[PDB]
Amino acid sequence: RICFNHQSSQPQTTKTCSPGESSCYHKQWSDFRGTIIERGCGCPTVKPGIKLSCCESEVCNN
């Protein structure tokens, strides 16, 4: 179980889901900086408008 842990465009990095954690989430949304993309293991909450794509598989937020 893996999950990308970066955002925007810097060199992609991967983090193996931590104990208890086993999901993968992709938080994509634009703002004043431009297209913003958060990612990591799990599936947190968000603000109305932001697009949250969660998958219980490996590497799914790149």
Question: Radius of gyration of the chain from Cα atoms?
Answer: 11
* Side-chain-facing half-sphere of 29: CA atoms under 13 Å: 12
Q: Are 55 and 24 in contact (CB under 8 A)?
A: yes
Joined tokens for residue 34? 């431009």
20 vs 13: CA distance, rounded Å: 21
Q: What is the CATH number of domain 1-62?
A: 2.10.60.10
State the method: NMR
Structure tokens at 53: 């794509």
CA 15 – CA 18 distance, rounded (Å): 8
User: Residue ranges of the domains in the chain?
Assistant: 1-62
